[PDB]
From Swiss-Prot, chain A:
Organism the protein comes from: Human immunodeficiency virus type 1 group M subtype B (isolate BH10) (HIV-1)
Organism lineage: Viruses, Riboviria, Pararnavirae, Artverviricota, Revtraviricetes
Part of the whole protein covered: 600 to 1026 of 1447
Result after altering W229A: Complete loss of RNA-dependent DNA polymerase activity. No effect on RNA 5'-end and 3'-end cleavages
Name under which the protein is recorded: p51 RT
Gene name of this polypeptide: gag-pol
Outcome recorded upon mutating L74V: No loss of polymerase activity. No loss of RNase H activity
Domain Reverse transcriptase: 44-234
Effect of S156T: Complete loss of polymerase activity. No loss of RNase H activity
Length: 427, 552
């Protein structure tokens, strides 16, 4: 702002060169947006213009955080990160409270705004270079380099750490039990209070950061409810299991049994303790598909005990901070999108699901984009780190739309997969 | 001469120091031929002499391949460029014309030897040191250093165009109506002010430019609509491709079939319906730069139709920012889909094709999307917005597939067009088993080595069969069976396969395939009334699948 700070030297990994990722092409809506936002930042000295000596380059999109109040810049520093924040995952690494996932409620407010004060280490700037495209490349992109810890970049936080924990102490006093996880751009306050009270703690907190320096646009509504007044409140209590619905309707046919013998014979990897031969012996004959069959010996029992190990979660499933978190989401049916967040095939960590409205924006590429931002937060909150998604979506379709319904300040990592086969009907 | 211009600071790649290559004391003829050139340079300020104390050296050459007036000195910077930091590659993005906007008066100024006036970091000049020799061990050599942008250096097309852009900025803010664009050595300036009213600004442009060392001759200059750029033909309102000639022979070799196929895509930018499947299905081989590749029957027919097309020349219209873009897809049948982008019906902005180069099985609906997609992505790049589609498909055909297709897609708004072929689900499988319909417990294993198999079935109705197969894979049989069952059964049938391959295939509902059998198992689906497929894992699932797995 107006009171210089001793910048914090920043070293890209030895042998690692700044990023040179190419700028995704934008709508002109998105440019005009960013084009304005930037000029702004530029006046504020927030960030400046560079030259051809800087060959580095990281992506920048534009989305809407509020509703449509007005656009917001979102630099996809996913790269500069791997080439930084990974080694700046320790050097100045922010810890993760493994209890936060338990508070009665977790409100989520950002602070990305704070970073915008601490000058960035002169030598490192060049790597945060980001470039506003032009429509049809009819002009040389406008080139900007940051002069303050930009936001998306996972090291603006770590540098700002010290400063936060300092602004956030005179509140940790008052309200002990409140947990505060700052992951990148946003703070995660979590408390076991009757809503209204917690909600207060938050506003009571926000008002804190606020009378100190930070500002939190967290003004969610404004004394007015017309059936849409959302302020990020999660509830890590219901983060739970088990909806693998084995049919029940007591009238099974050769066809009904058939499918069963399969889904059961499927989970033999995620569950090696399930037999089926005895129920498959029920099929042993070449009977019609719409004929009803009868419950056999161990089979009738086998449906019980094999519907029983189907209640006791797979053991051996422990988070491995070494490995990565993968999360494959799968189109289920209208509105519902089942998912899983494993680290090593068939050892699933969480297996929720999700849904959205038909009439109102009934869309896949929207649901998914939300089922991610949601699936993601389960993570940020649970294991304090965004996953990598095996997105059942055409690389280029997603490539085009996500930015839209995308609310978040972060971009996870993702990839696109050919076809889930015998998995949409199971979990 | 040189400029007052601020000099972009350059640094050589980490640690690496300056080049120290030597000149092979060449034709003492050319020698004094450089000595005169160099001297006209040091005077123009372009370079300078320096005490041999700490410099390096780059090979210095003098030449004139030519059959003209003089000699040109050419410094080989290879081993310097191998030591210079990298720069911001900006020609990396090329503006596609189909998104350019009409423009009245367009001019281009020659800047080519302008970089010679743009200073060079006064601290990266030592590395441009070169040594022009003397008669023969006559002088240590006339020794100079570059003061501006060496004509070879890596960081030159960059630093120049940087510097340039900067210089023009103000002139571009006091003429916010006109527009300037550069291209290596070509600066083009296009505007609206009548060519006359245009000339002044270009002169003012020239006067602005000269106010910064950048000079600009008008003689043997350029204005030649058509403008040959990036392999285009640019007129102040229309646009098109380089003269596209399709060589003809009776003997083809990859080296030529490629230049043929590629050149055939480039034309697709504006030439309607151009195909390329059949033609490049050939170059679909091993690295033979001269393998004698004999055009097959389709290649011919296809190359033929590309002529019928390419023959008749075509034009390209521009984009009106104030008029929604439209785009239509036509299906050519062989996974070949052609499109064209319009704002106004009897002329184009740009056209295009899309073919499912992918794996082994696809779909006209699926493809229609990929195409719908391929297009969307292009618009965003060119015009900065997505187009309003008009596609050969019905809301009912679409919505069904996406609602029953495991992958998640999203097609912007789209208006239907009865223009056949009509994209439409050629069939659907039962979600539930048909009651009363004979069940075909099917299968067909094969010997991986013996390349010999069997494929038959066994019905509840007690009806069996086992046809023999020679020259077959296993998946080939797991599909023979199916086809086989479908074959001896009523307009209603329930099929049981142990083949997830066969299933994962059928379930995708391919309307066509690269297989001789999947295209047959398809036209039997097309004919049936009620078909429901079922999956029972091979071995374990030897339930009813038992009797079926034994015979074979
Ligand atoms: N001939 C020609 C010609 C055709 C179209 C346009 N229209 C536009 S919007 N382009 C420009 N602003 C500038 C421009 C480009 Cl992109 C490429 C070559 C030359 C020039 Cl001047 C400019 C020139
Ligand atoms: Mg079998």
């Amino acid at each position: 702002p107006i009171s210089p700070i001793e910048t914090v030297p920043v070293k890209l990994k030895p042998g690692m060169d700044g990023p040179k990722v190419k700028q995704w092409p934008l709508t002109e809506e998105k440019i005009k947006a960013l084009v304005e936002i930037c000029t702004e930042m530029e006046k504020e000295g927030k960030i400046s213009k560079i030259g051809p000596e800087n060959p580095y380059n990281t992506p920048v999109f534009a989305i809407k955080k509020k509703d449509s109040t007005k656009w917001r810049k979102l630099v996809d520093f996913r790269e500069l990160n791997k080439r930084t924040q990974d080694f700046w995952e320790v050097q100045l690494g922010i810890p993760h409270p493994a209890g936060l996932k338990k508070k009665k409620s977790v409100t989520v407010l950002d602070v990305g705004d704070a970073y915008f004060s601490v000058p960035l280490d002169e030598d490192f700037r060049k790597y945060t270079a980001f470039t506003i495209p032009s429509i049809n490349n009819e002009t040389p992109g406008i080139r900007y380099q940051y002069n303050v810890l930009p936001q998306g970049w996972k090291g603006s936080p770590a540098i700002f750490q010290s400063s936060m924990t300092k602004i956030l102490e005179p509140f940790k006093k008052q309200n002990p039990d409140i947990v505060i996880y700052q992951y990148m751009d946003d703070l995660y306050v979590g408390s076991d209070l009757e809503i209204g009270q917690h909600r207060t703690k938050i506003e009571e907190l926000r008002q804190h950061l606020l009378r100190w320096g930070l500002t939190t646009p967290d003004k969610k509504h404004q004394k007015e409810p017309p059936f849409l007044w959302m302020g990020y409140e999660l509830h890590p209590d219901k983060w739970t299991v088990q909806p693998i619905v084995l049919p029940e309707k007591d009238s099974w046919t050769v066809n009904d049994i058939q499918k069963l013998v399969g889904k059961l014979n499927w989970a033999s990897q995620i569950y090696p303790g399930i037999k089926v031969r005895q129920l498959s012996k029920l099929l042993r004959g070449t009977k019609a598909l719409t004929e009803v069959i009868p419950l056999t010996e161990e089979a009738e029992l086998e449906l019980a005990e094999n519907r029983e190990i189907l209640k006791e979660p797979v053991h051996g499933v422990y988070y491995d901070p070494s490995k990565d978190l993968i999360a494959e989401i799968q189109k289920q049916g209208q509105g519902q999108w089942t998912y899983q967040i494993y680290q090593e095939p068939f050892k699933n960590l969480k297996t929720g699901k999700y849904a959205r409205m038909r009439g109102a924006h009934t869309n896949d590429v929207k649901q998914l984009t939300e089922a991610v931002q949601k699936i993601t937060t389960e993570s940020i909150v649970i294991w304090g780190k965004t996953p990598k998604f095996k997105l059942p979506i055409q690389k280029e379709t997603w490539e085009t739309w996500w930015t839209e319904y995308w609310q978040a300040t972060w971009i996870p990592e993702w990839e696109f997969v050919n076809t889930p086969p015998l998995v949409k009907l199971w979990y | 001469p040189i400029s007052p211009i601020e000099t972009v600071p350059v640094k050589l790649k980490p640690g690496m120091d300056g080049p120290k290559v030597k000149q092979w004391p060449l034709t003492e003829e050319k020698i004094k031929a450089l000595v005169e050139i160099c001297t006209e340079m040091e005077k123009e300020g372009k370079i300078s002499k320096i005490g041999p104390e700490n410099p390096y050296n780059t090979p210095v050459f003098a030449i004139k391949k030519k059959d003209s007036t003089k000699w040109r000195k050419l410094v080989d910077f290879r081993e310097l460029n191998k030591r210079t930091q990298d720069f911001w590659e900006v020609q990396l993005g090329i503006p596609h014309p189909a998104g350019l906007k009409k423009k009245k008066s367009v001019t281009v100024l020659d800047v080519g030897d302008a970089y010679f006036s743009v200073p060079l970091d006064e601290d990266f000049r030592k590395y441009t040191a070169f040594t022009i020799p003397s008669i023969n061990n006559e002088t240590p050599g006339i020794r100079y250093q570059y003061n501006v942008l060496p004509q070879g250096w890596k960081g030159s097309p960059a630093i120049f165009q940087s510097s340039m852009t900067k210089i023009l900025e103000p002139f571009k803010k006091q003429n916010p109506d006109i527009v300037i664009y550069q291209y290596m050595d070509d600066l083009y300036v296009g505007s609206d002010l009548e060519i006359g009213q245009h000339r002044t600004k270009i002169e003012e442009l020239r006067q602005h430019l000269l106010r910064w060392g950048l000079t600009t001759p008008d003689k043997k200059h350029q204005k030649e609509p058509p403008f040959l750029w990036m392999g285009y033909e640019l007129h102040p309102d229309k646009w098109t491709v380089q003269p596209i000639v399709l060589p003809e022979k009776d003997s083809w070799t990859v080296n030529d079939i490629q230049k043929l196929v590629g050149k055939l895509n480039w034309a697709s930018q504006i030439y309607p319906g151009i195909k390329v499947r059949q033609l490049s299905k050939l170059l679909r081989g091993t690295k033979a730069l001269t393998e004698v590749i004999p055009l097959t029957e389709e290649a011919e027919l296809e190359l033929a139709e590309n002529r019928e097309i390419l023959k008749e020349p075509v034009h390209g219209v521009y984009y009106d920012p104030s008029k929604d873009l439209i785009a239509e897809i036509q299906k050519q049948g062989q996974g070949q889909w052609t499109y064209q982008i319009y704002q106004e019906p009897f002329k184009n902005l740009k056209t295009g094709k899309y073919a499912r180069m992918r794996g082994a099985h696809t779909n006209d609906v699926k493809q229609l999307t990929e195409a719908v997609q391929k297009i969307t992505t292009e618009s965003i790049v060119i015009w900065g917005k997505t187009p309003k589609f008009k596609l050969p498909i019905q809301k009912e055909t679409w919505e069904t597939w996406w609602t029953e297709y495991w992958q998640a897609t999203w097609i912007p708004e789209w208006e239907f067009v009865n223009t056949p072929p009509l994209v439409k689900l050629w069939y659907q499988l039962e979600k539930e088993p048909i009651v009363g319909a004979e069940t075909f417990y099917v299968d067909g294993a094969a010997n991986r080595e013996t390349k010999l198999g069997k494929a038959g079935y066994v019905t509840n109705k007690g009806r069996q069969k086992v046809v023999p197969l020679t020259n077959t894979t296993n998946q080939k049989t797991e599909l023979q069976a199916i086809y086989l069952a479908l074959q001896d059964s009523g307009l209603e049938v329930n099929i049981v396969t142990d083949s997830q391959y066969a299933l994962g295939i059928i379930q995708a509902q391919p309307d066509k395939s690269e297989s001789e059998l999947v295209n047959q198992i398809i036209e039997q689906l097309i004919k049936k009334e009620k078909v429901y497929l079922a999956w029972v894992p091979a071995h374990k699932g030897i339930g009813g699948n038992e009797q079926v797995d034994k015979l074979v």
